[PDB]
Amino acid sequence: KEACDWLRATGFPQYAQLYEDFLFPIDISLVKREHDFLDRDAIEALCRRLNTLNKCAVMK
Numbered sequence: 001k002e003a004c005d006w007l008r009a010t011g012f013p014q015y016a017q018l019y020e021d022f023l024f025p026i027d028i029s030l031v032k033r034e035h036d037f038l039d040r041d042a043i044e045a046l047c048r049r050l051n052t053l054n055k056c057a058v059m060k
Contacts, residue, residue: 003049018053025054 004016018026028047035046 022057
């Protein structure tokens, strides 16, 4: 939830909806090209939240 709620607050309802698509994990590295304009500090937060979504998709 804290991923979807923070994603709502930055203005990314698309990435909150992406959690419901837990049938496959996404290319985080491809997402890193779509928003390469920002620093690795906000990459670390976005990657942590999108990796929570991927972690739930492939919970080994």
